[PDB]
Protein backbone atom coordinates (compact mmCIF):
# COMPACT_ATOMS: atom_id res chain seq x y z
CA UNK A 1 0.00 0.00 0.00
CA UNK A 2 2.69 2.53 1.02
CA UNK A 3 4.85 0.69 -1.56
CA UNK A 4 4.89 0.50 -5.36
CA UNK A 5 3.14 -2.64 -6.62
CA UNK A 6 3.32 -3.87 -10.21
CA UNK A 7 0.91 -6.67 -11.12
CA UNK A 8 2.31 -9.86 -12.65
CA UNK A 9 0.39 -12.15 -14.98
CA UNK A 10 1.49 -15.62 -16.11
CA UNK A 11 0.08 -16.93 -19.41
CA UNK A 12 1.94 -19.85 -21.01
CA UNK A 13 4.47 -21.09 -18.42
CA UNK A 14 7.58 -19.91 -20.37
CA UNK A 15 7.99 -16.40 -18.85
CA UNK A 16 5.68 -13.99 -17.00
CA UNK A 17 5.59 -10.23 -17.56
CA UNK A 18 4.89 -6.84 -16.07
CA UNK A 19 3.94 -3.44 -17.49
CA UNK A 20 5.65 -0.08 -17.30
CA UNK A 21 5.86 3.01 -19.48
CA UNK A 22 8.60 5.09 -21.03
CA UNK A 23 8.10 8.70 -22.05
CA UNK A 24 6.26 11.72 -20.68
CA UNK A 25 3.20 10.53 -22.61
CA UNK A 26 3.11 7.09 -20.93
CA UNK A 27 4.05 4.98 -23.97
CA UNK A 28 3.18 1.40 -22.82
CA UNK A 29 5.44 -1.67 -23.00
CA UNK A 30 5.37 -5.24 -21.71
CA UNK A 31 8.50 -6.07 -19.76
CA UNK A 32 10.35 -9.09 -18.51
CA UNK A 33 11.32 -8.00 -15.00
CA UNK A 34 14.80 -9.46 -14.86
CA UNK A 35 16.91 -9.67 -11.68
CA UNK A 36 19.68 -11.18 -13.81
CA UNK A 37 20.46 -8.06 -15.83
CA UNK A 38 20.95 -4.34 -15.17
CA UNK A 39 19.55 -2.43 -18.14
CA UNK A 40 16.14 -1.39 -19.42
CA UNK A 41 15.48 -1.45 -23.16
CA UNK A 42 12.55 -1.08 -25.51
CA UNK A 43 12.24 -1.74 -29.24
CA UNK A 44 12.52 1.53 -31.17
CA UNK A 45 10.50 2.77 -34.15
CA UNK A 46 14.03 2.89 -35.57
CA UNK A 47 14.16 -0.87 -35.25
CA UNK A 48 14.75 -2.35 -38.71
CA UNK A 49 14.56 -6.05 -37.85
CA UNK A 50 11.47 -8.27 -38.15
CA UNK A 51 11.09 -9.09 -34.47
CA UNK A 52 9.91 -5.53 -33.99
CA UNK A 53 7.08 -5.72 -36.53
CA UNK A 54 4.68 -6.95 -33.82
CA UNK A 55 6.06 -5.18 -30.75
CA UNK A 56 5.19 -1.91 -28.96
CA UNK A 57 7.59 0.69 -30.29
CA UNK A 58 9.01 3.69 -28.45
CA UNK A 59 8.88 6.94 -30.41
CA UNK A 60 11.05 9.58 -28.74
CA UNK A 61 9.45 12.27 -30.96
CA UNK A 62 6.20 11.97 -29.00
CA UNK A 63 7.53 12.56 -25.48
CA UNK A 64 8.33 16.09 -24.17
CA UNK A 65 10.82 14.68 -21.70
CA UNK A 66 12.97 12.70 -24.18
CA UNK A 67 16.67 13.52 -24.10
CA UNK A 68 19.12 12.25 -26.77
CA UNK A 69 22.21 10.21 -25.84
CA UNK A 70 22.98 8.10 -28.91
CA UNK A 71 26.01 6.10 -27.77
CA UNK A 72 25.82 2.54 -29.12
CA UNK A 73 25.34 -0.35 -26.75
CA UNK A 74 24.96 -4.12 -27.07
CA UNK A 75 23.28 -6.52 -24.66
CA UNK A 76 24.32 -10.18 -24.41
CA UNK A 77 22.05 -12.57 -22.55
CA UNK A 78 22.29 -16.32 -22.08
CA UNK A 79 19.38 -16.56 -24.55
CA UNK A 80 20.32 -13.85 -27.02
CA UNK A 81 21.68 -10.45 -28.00
CA UNK A 82 20.03 -7.12 -28.83
CA UNK A 83 21.57 -3.83 -29.85
CA UNK A 84 20.60 -0.19 -30.16
CA UNK A 85 21.56 3.11 -28.55
CA UNK A 86 21.13 4.80 -25.19
CA UNK A 87 18.49 7.46 -24.64
CA UNK A 88 17.10 9.31 -21.63
CA UNK A 89 13.46 9.73 -20.67
CA UNK A 90 10.87 9.48 -17.89
CA UNK A 91 10.37 5.82 -16.95
CA UNK A 92 7.22 4.95 -15.02
CA UNK A 93 6.95 1.71 -13.01
CA UNK A 94 3.72 1.36 -11.08
CA UNK A 95 2.82 4.68 -9.45
CA UNK A 96 6.33 6.21 -9.43
CA UNK A 97 8.21 7.96 -12.21
CA UNK A 98 11.79 9.09 -12.66
CA UNK A 99 14.21 10.25 -15.36
CA UNK A 100 16.23 7.25 -16.47
CA UNK A 101 18.81 6.17 -19.03
CA UNK A 102 17.58 3.38 -21.25
CA UNK A 103 18.37 1.60 -24.50
CA UNK A 104 16.40 1.99 -27.75
CA UNK A 105 16.81 -1.39 -29.45
CA UNK A 106 16.96 -1.25 -33.27
CA UNK A 107 18.46 -4.69 -33.93
CA UNK A 108 16.82 -7.87 -32.66
CA UNK A 109 18.20 -10.39 -35.19
CA UNK A 110 20.47 -11.85 -32.53
CA UNK A 111 17.51 -12.61 -30.25
CA UNK A 112 15.50 -14.92 -32.53
CA UNK A 113 13.57 -17.05 -32.85
CA UNK A 114 12.79 -16.32 -29.21
CA UNK A 115 11.89 -12.63 -29.59
CA UNK A 116 9.31 -12.95 -32.37
CA UNK A 117 7.92 -16.06 -30.68
CA UNK A 118 7.58 -14.57 -27.20
CA UNK A 119 5.09 -11.78 -26.47
CA UNK A 120 7.07 -9.14 -24.60
CA UNK A 121 8.40 -5.86 -25.97
CA UNK A 122 11.50 -5.41 -23.84
CA UNK A 123 13.37 -6.17 -20.64
CA UNK A 124 13.74 -4.26 -17.39
CA UNK A 125 16.82 -5.18 -15.38
CA UNK A 126 16.64 -5.26 -11.60
CA UNK A 127 20.24 -6.08 -10.79
CA UNK A 128 23.29 -4.19 -9.52
CA UNK A 129 25.13 -1.20 -11.04
CA UNK A 130 28.44 -2.98 -11.75
CA UNK A 131 26.49 -5.47 -13.89
CA UNK A 132 24.92 -2.72 -15.99
CA UNK A 133 26.23 -1.05 -19.14
CA UNK A 134 26.73 2.70 -19.13
CA UNK A 135 27.04 2.92 -15.35
CA UNK A 136 23.31 3.08 -14.62
CA UNK A 137 22.02 2.89 -11.07
CA UNK A 138 19.28 0.34 -10.42
CA UNK A 139 15.76 1.81 -10.59
CA UNK A 140 15.00 0.79 -6.99
CA UNK A 141 18.21 2.41 -5.82
CA UNK A 142 17.50 5.72 -7.53
CA UNK A 143 13.91 5.69 -6.27
CA UNK A 144 15.30 5.42 -2.73
CA UNK A 145 17.89 8.17 -2.91
CA UNK A 146 15.19 10.39 -4.39
CA UNK A 147 13.23 9.73 -1.21
CA UNK A 148 10.51 8.05 -3.28
CA UNK A 149 10.40 4.71 -1.50
CA UNK A 150 10.83 3.55 2.13
CA UNK A 151 13.72 1.13 1.56
CA UNK A 152 16.04 0.23 -1.30
CA UNK A 153 14.61 -3.27 -1.66
CA UNK A 154 12.06 -5.05 -3.83
CA UNK A 155 10.15 -8.29 -3.58
CA UNK A 156 8.78 -10.89 -5.93
CA UNK A 157 5.65 -12.92 -5.32
CA UNK A 158 5.37 -14.78 -8.61
CA UNK A 159 2.06 -15.59 -10.27
CA UNK A 160 0.95 -19.15 -10.83
CA UNK A 161 -0.72 -19.98 -14.15
CA UNK A 162 -4.51 -19.91 -13.97
CA UNK A 163 -4.48 -19.55 -10.18
CA UNK A 164 -3.43 -16.19 -8.70
CA UNK A 165 -1.59 -13.20 -10.14
CA UNK A 166 1.73 -11.92 -8.81
CA UNK A 167 3.42 -8.75 -7.60
CA UNK A 168 6.66 -6.82 -7.94
CA UNK A 169 6.77 -4.67 -4.80
CA UNK A 170 9.21 -1.78 -4.60
CA UNK A 171 10.35 -0.25 -1.33
CA UNK A 172 8.73 -2.52 1.24
CA UNK A 173 8.27 -6.04 2.56
CA UNK A 174 4.57 -6.88 2.79
CA UNK A 175 3.85 -9.86 5.07
CA UNK A 176 0.68 -10.58 3.08
CA UNK A 177 2.96 -12.47 0.68
CA UNK A 178 4.46 -15.17 2.85
CA UNK A 179 4.36 -17.20 6.03
CA UNK A 180 6.96 -18.39 8.49
CA UNK A 181 10.34 -16.72 9.07
CA UNK A 182 12.19 -14.70 6.45
CA UNK A 183 15.79 -15.92 6.31
CA UNK A 184 18.37 -13.50 4.84
CA UNK A 185 21.43 -14.66 2.87
CA UNK A 186 24.48 -12.47 2.21
CA UNK A 187 25.62 -11.77 -1.35
CA UNK A 188 29.22 -12.62 -2.25
CA UNK A 189 29.39 -9.79 -4.82
CA UNK A 190 27.41 -6.70 -5.73
CA UNK A 191 27.10 -7.85 -9.34
CA UNK A 192 24.44 -10.57 -9.40
CA UNK A 193 21.85 -11.48 -6.80
CA UNK A 194 24.22 -14.34 -6.01
CA UNK A 195 24.59 -16.06 -2.64
CA UNK A 196 26.37 -19.19 -1.34
CA UNK A 197 24.51 -22.36 -0.36
CA UNK A 198 25.17 -26.10 -0.19
CA UNK A 199 23.39 -28.03 -2.95
CA UNK A 200 22.31 -31.52 -1.96
CA UNK A 201 20.10 -33.06 -4.68
CA UNK A 202 19.54 -36.68 -3.75
CA UNK A 203 22.93 -38.23 -3.14
CA UNK A 204 24.86 -35.60 -5.13
CA UNK A 205 26.39 -32.75 -3.08
CA UNK A 206 27.98 -29.42 -4.03
CA UNK A 207 29.39 -27.70 -0.91
CA UNK A 208 29.46 -23.87 -1.04
CA UNK A 209 27.71 -23.78 -4.42
CA UNK A 210 27.35 -20.43 -6.20
CA UNK A 211 23.60 -19.61 -6.35
CA UNK A 212 21.84 -16.94 -8.40
CA UNK A 213 18.24 -16.07 -7.54
CA UNK A 214 17.02 -15.03 -10.99
CA UNK A 215 13.54 -13.95 -12.16
CA UNK A 216 14.83 -13.93 -15.74
CA UNK A 217 15.27 -17.69 -15.95
CA UNK A 218 12.29 -19.95 -16.54
CA UNK A 219 14.07 -23.11 -15.38
CA UNK A 220 16.38 -24.33 -12.63
CA UNK A 221 19.95 -24.24 -13.97
CA UNK A 222 22.50 -26.83 -12.86
CA UNK A 223 26.10 -27.68 -13.80
CA UNK A 224 25.84 -30.28 -16.58
CA UNK A 225 28.08 -32.73 -14.70
CA UNK A 226 25.80 -32.42 -11.68
CA UNK A 227 22.62 -32.87 -13.74
CA UNK A 228 23.94 -36.07 -15.33
CA UNK A 229 24.84 -37.70 -11.98
CA UNK A 230 21.79 -36.40 -10.15
CA UNK A 231 19.50 -38.29 -12.56
CA UNK A 232 21.52 -41.49 -12.88
CA UNK A 233 18.93 -44.06 -11.75
CA UNK A 234 15.65 -42.22 -11.36
CA UNK A 235 14.03 -43.60 -14.53
CA UNK A 236 14.43 -40.31 -16.43
CA UNK A 237 15.24 -40.27 -20.14
CA UNK A 238 17.12 -37.46 -21.87
CA UNK A 239 15.91 -36.84 -25.42
CA UNK A 240 18.52 -38.43 -27.78
CA UNK A 241 19.64 -35.03 -29.09
CA UNK A 242 16.93 -32.71 -27.82
CA UNK A 243 17.94 -30.91 -24.57
CA UNK A 244 14.94 -32.01 -22.48
CA UNK A 245 14.20 -34.57 -19.81
CA UNK A 246 10.91 -36.42 -20.05
CA UNK A 247 9.68 -38.71 -17.28
CA UNK A 248 6.48 -39.96 -15.71
CA UNK A 249 4.83 -37.31 -13.56
CA UNK A 250 4.19 -40.04 -11.01
CA UNK A 251 7.81 -41.22 -11.10
CA UNK A 252 8.53 -41.87 -7.40
CA UNK A 253 12.29 -41.38 -7.95
CA UNK A 254 12.04 -37.68 -8.82
CA UNK A 255 14.49 -35.92 -6.45
CA UNK A 256 14.05 -32.83 -4.26
CA UNK A 257 16.59 -30.00 -4.42
CA UNK A 258 17.95 -29.07 -1.02
CA UNK A 259 20.10 -25.97 -0.59
CA UNK A 260 21.34 -25.10 2.90
CA UNK A 261 23.05 -22.25 4.71
CA UNK A 262 23.72 -21.48 8.37
CA UNK A 263 20.45 -19.56 8.43
CA UNK A 264 18.09 -21.64 6.33
CA UNK A 265 17.12 -24.74 4.43
CA UNK A 266 15.26 -24.32 1.14
CA UNK A 267 13.77 -27.28 -0.69
CA UNK A 268 12.25 -27.58 -4.16
CA UNK A 269 10.01 -30.64 -4.51
CA UNK A 270 9.08 -32.15 -7.91
CA UNK A 271 5.65 -30.46 -7.91
CA UNK A 272 7.63 -27.26 -8.59
CA UNK A 273 9.66 -28.25 -11.63
CA UNK A 274 7.41 -30.74 -13.43
CA UNK A 275 5.66 -29.72 -16.62
CA UNK A 276 2.77 -31.97 -17.64
CA UNK A 277 2.82 -32.64 -21.39
CA UNK A 278 -0.13 -35.02 -21.87
CA UNK A 279 -0.02 -34.09 -25.58
CA UNK A 280 3.31 -35.92 -25.94
CA UNK A 281 2.08 -38.78 -23.74
CA UNK A 282 -0.61 -39.57 -21.15
CA UNK A 283 1.08 -39.17 -17.76
CA UNK A 284 4.22 -37.58 -19.16
CA UNK A 285 6.00 -34.58 -17.68
CA UNK A 286 9.09 -32.60 -18.68
CA UNK A 287 11.49 -31.50 -15.93
CA UNK A 288 12.02 -27.76 -15.82
CA UNK A 289 15.72 -28.26 -15.16
CA UNK A 290 18.55 -27.54 -17.55
CA UNK A 291 22.31 -27.73 -17.78
CA UNK A 292 24.38 -24.56 -17.88
CA UNK A 293 28.02 -24.46 -16.87
CA UNK A 294 29.90 -21.59 -15.28
CA UNK A 295 33.66 -21.62 -14.61
CA UNK A 296 32.82 -22.28 -10.95
CA UNK A 297 29.95 -24.59 -10.05
CA UNK A 298 26.78 -22.50 -10.13
CA UNK A 299 23.02 -22.99 -10.04
CA UNK A 300 20.44 -20.50 -11.26
CA UNK A 301 17.52 -20.62 -8.84
CA UNK A 302 14.98 -19.71 -11.51
CA UNK A 303 11.23 -19.13 -11.60
CA UNK A 304 10.41 -22.65 -10.35
CA UNK A 305 12.20 -21.69 -7.10
CA UNK A 306 10.85 -18.14 -6.76
CA UNK A 307 7.43 -19.59 -7.39
CA UNK A 308 7.57 -21.48 -4.11
CA UNK A 309 9.64 -18.92 -2.26
CA UNK A 310 8.81 -15.28 -1.72
CA UNK A 311 12.05 -13.36 -2.20
CA UNK A 312 13.44 -10.03 -0.98
CA UNK A 313 16.17 -8.27 -2.98
CA UNK A 314 17.69 -5.83 -0.48
CA UNK A 315 20.38 -3.45 -1.77
CA UNK A 316 20.84 -1.65 1.56
CA UNK A 317 21.74 -4.96 3.15
CA UNK A 318 23.43 -6.54 0.14
CA UNK A 319 21.48 -9.70 0.78
CA UNK A 320 18.57 -11.80 -0.47
CA UNK A 321 15.73 -12.79 1.80
CA UNK A 322 13.83 -16.02 1.37
CA UNK A 323 10.42 -16.92 2.74
CA UNK A 324 7.87 -19.61 1.92
CA UNK A 325 5.21 -17.94 -0.25
CA UNK A 326 1.52 -17.85 0.65
CA UNK A 327 -0.12 -20.27 -1.77
CA UNK A 328 -2.84 -17.65 -2.22
CA UNK A 329 -3.66 -14.10 -1.26
Amino acid sequence: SSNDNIELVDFQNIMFYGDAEVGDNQQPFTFILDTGSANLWVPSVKCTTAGCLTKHLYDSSKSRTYEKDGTKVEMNYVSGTVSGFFSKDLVTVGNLSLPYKFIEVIDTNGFEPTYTASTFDGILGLGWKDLSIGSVDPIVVELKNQNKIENALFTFYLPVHDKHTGFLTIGGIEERFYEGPLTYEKLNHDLYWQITLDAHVGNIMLEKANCIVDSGTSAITVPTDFLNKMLQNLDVIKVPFLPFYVTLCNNSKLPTFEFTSENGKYTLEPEYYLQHIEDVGPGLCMLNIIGLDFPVPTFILGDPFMRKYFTVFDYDNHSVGIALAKKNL
Partner: peptide, 8 residues
Protein backbone atom coordinates in the same frame (compact mmCIF):
# COMPACT_ATOMS: atom_id res chain seq x y z
CA UNK B 1 19.43 -22.26 -25.48
CA UNK B 2 18.07 -22.31 -21.94
CA UNK B 3 15.55 -19.45 -21.51
CA UNK B 4 17.57 -17.12 -19.27
CA UNK B 5 18.02 -13.36 -19.64
CA UNK B 6 21.09 -13.34 -17.41
CA UNK B 7 23.71 -11.01 -18.94
CA UNK B 8 27.46 -11.48 -19.42
Amino acid sequence: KPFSXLQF
